Design a protein around this ligand. Structure first.
Ligand SMILES: O=C(O)[C@@H]1CN(c2ncnc3[nH]c4cc(F)ccc4c23)CC12CCC2
Length: 167
């Protein structure tokens, strides 16, 4: 038993809800919240900009130190940093950004990072400003992640489309 509430169950291990991930994180304090990161951990907009704003820019300060030490992530890769006031940990995961021409097949590699964590609160990778089809992203999530994932979908309209079209 865990503290996630109001989710629709899609499969044995994937759950979905219409929610703001920042507010969902603020209430649940999950062990892991996933950020839709870029390779530079520049949290300017989308989910990343919203998560970072909710931390009062502490996520960005920590991220800049991480990059200064380690260099950029790989597309499809991840790193674990603090969850600040939102979660114990933040798993920063880089999905391919279609608006940069990155290979959508890397989306599966991105979701594989979730399997290193037993339970996660997450957005749909490569959705939103990353330019991928959120329905495809949901399919890859379901077919790749084996751990327990609670997906927060900000837009009520898209949520209904994702549920109604789910096979
Ligand atoms: O940034 C993107 O392209 C979208 C944003 N989406 C979100 N999903 C779940 N909660 C969210 N709260 C927010 C608050 C904001 F101010 C901006 C975006 C969100 C948001 C998923 C996405 C595809 C992977 C990242």
């Amino acid at each position: 038993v865990n503290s996630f509430s109001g989710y629709l169950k899609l499969t044995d291990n994937v759950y979905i809800k219409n929610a703001d991930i920042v507010e969902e994180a603020k209430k649940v304090k999950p062990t892991v919240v996933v950020n839709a990161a870029n390779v530079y951990l520049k949290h300017g907009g989308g989910v990343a900009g919203a998560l970072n704003k909710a931390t009062n820019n502490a996520m960005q300060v920590e991220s800049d130190d991480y990059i200064a030490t380690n260099g950029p992530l790989k597309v499809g890769g991840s790193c674990v940093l603090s969850g600040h006031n939102l979660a114990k940990h933040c798993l920063h995961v880089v999905g391919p950004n279609v608006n940069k021409g990155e290979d959508i097949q890397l989306l599966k590699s991105a979701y594989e990072n979730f399997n290193q964590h037993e339970v996660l609160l997450a957005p749909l990778l490569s959705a939103g400003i990353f330019g991928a089809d959120p329905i495809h992203s949901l399919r890859v999530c379901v077919d790749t992640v084996r751990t327990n994932v609670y997906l927060a979908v900000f837009d009520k309209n898209l949520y209904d489309k994702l549920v109604s079209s789910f096979l």
